[PDB]
């Protein structure tokens, strides 16, 4: 019920992904498709939990 | 573009409004002094040829 949070969560999820891409010296979106982030750690991904792929 | 400019009241109340048609954005471009509170740096457009 709090829209401020939903905006804040979308921003924050994008900041975490962008910091991981900065660490790899590249921000090009096709080298980093979301499979590399969302895939669970048991398959080798980072395993991040999602909240920011919603419609606001 | 990027924006140029960046309380409880009676004048803005919703019980007094007759919502017949909505006010589109095109109308506010067309008659800018009528449909805007605060038109700064606004240009009047050519009306008709």
């Amino acid at each position: 019920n709090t829209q401020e949070l939903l905006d804040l969560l979308v921003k924050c999820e994008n900041k975490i992904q962008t910091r991981i891409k900065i660490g790899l010296n590249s921000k090009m979106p096709s080298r980093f498709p979301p499979v590399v982030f969302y895939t669970p750690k048991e398959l080798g991904g980072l395993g991040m939990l999602s909240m920011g792929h919603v419609l606001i | 573009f990027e924006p140029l400019v960046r309380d409880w009241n009676e004048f803005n109340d919703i019980n007094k409004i007759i919502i017949r048609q909505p006010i589109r954005t095109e109308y506010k471009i067309a008659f800018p002094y009528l449909y805007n509170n605060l038109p700064h740096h606004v240009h009047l457009t050519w009306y008709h040829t």
């Binding site: 905006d7 979308v10 921003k11 999820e13 994008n14 | 924006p3 589109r24 954005t25």
Partner: peptide
Amino acid sequence: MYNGIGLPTPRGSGTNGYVQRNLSLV
């Protein structure tokens, strides 16, 4: 910002800012 809806700028939002109308209104 068309019809008083949307972000005045999509910049720093983390998203492209595409807005569609709600299709499940009654």
